[PDB]
């Protein structure tokens, strides 16, 4: 494996949030391996993340806050408490 790490800034589109869904978390592992990583599970068509993130990107950080082995609701709450912008550091299996 290689992991490519990118950071993106998503601008809130009101009525549409940041146009992503997240899964995973240590209380909610997405993968059959039990890996606990927060992951992008859906990107809204036409929304703020279109062409910036894909399903299964691993989320390392949200607005500078580590998502290492955190609860699902902690990741959600970090997104929710973002301003106009959400800086999301991801890692992609390349």
From Swiss-Prot:
Record's subcellular location: Cell membrane; Cell junction, Tight junction; Cell junction; Cell junction, Gap junction
Modifications the protein undergoes after translation, according to the UniProt entry: Phosphorylated at tyrosine redidues in response to epidermal growth factor (EGF). This response is dependent on an intact actin microfilament system. Dephosphorylated by PTPRJ.
Signal peptide interval: none
Compositional bias per record (Basic residues), positions renumbered to this chain: 86-94
Domain PDZ: 7-94
Domain of life: Eukaryota
Tissue: The alpha-containing isoform is found in most epithelial cell junctions. The short isoform is found both in endothelial cells and the highly specialized epithelial junctions of renal glomeruli and Sertoli cells of the seminiferous tubules.
Protein family: Belongs to the MAGUK family.
Free-text comment on this protein's domains from its UniProt entry: The 244-aa domain between residues 633 and 876 is the primary occludin (OCLN)-binding site and is required for stable association with the tight junction.
Function of the molecule: TJP1, TJP2, and TJP3 are closely related scaffolding proteins that link tight junction (TJ) transmembrane proteins such as claudins, junctional adhesion molecules, and occludin to the actin cytoskeleton. Forms a multistranded TJP1/ZO1 condensate which elongates to form a tight junction belt, the belt is anchored at the apical cell membrane via interaction with PATJ. The tight junction acts to limit movement of substances through the paracellular space and as a boundary between the compositionally distinct apical and basolateral plasma membrane domains of epithelial and endothelial cells.
Subunit structure as annotated in this protein's UniProt entry: Homodimer. Forms heterodimers TJP3. Forms a heterodimer (via PDZ2 domain) with TJP2/ZO2 (via PDZ2 domain). Interacts with OCLN, CALM, claudins, CGN/cingulin, CXADR, GJA12, GJD3 and UBN1. Interacts (via ZU5 domain) with CDC42BPB and MYZAP. Interacts (via PDZ domain) with GJA1. Interacts (via PDZ domains) with ANKRD2. Interacts with POPDC1 (via the C-terminus cytoplasmic tail). Interacts with HSPA4 and KIRREL1. Interacts with DLL1. Interacts with USP53 (via the C-terminal region). Interacts (via ABR region) with F-actin.
Protein name: Tight junction protein 1
Full protein: residues contained: 18 to 110 of 1748
């Amino acid at each position: 494996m290689i992991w490519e790490q990118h950071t993106v800034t998503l601008h809130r589109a009101p009525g549409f949030g940041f146009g992503i869904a997240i899964s995973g978390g240590r209380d909610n592992p997405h993968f059959q391996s039990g890996e606990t990583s927060i992951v992008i599970s859906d990107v809204l068509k036409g929304g703020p993340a279109e062409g910036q993130l894909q399903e299964n990107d691993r989320v390392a950080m949200v607005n500078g806050v580590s998502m290492d082995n955190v609860e699902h609701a902690f990741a959600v709450q970090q997104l929710r408490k973002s301003g106009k912008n959400a800086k999301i550091t991801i890692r992609r299996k390349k």
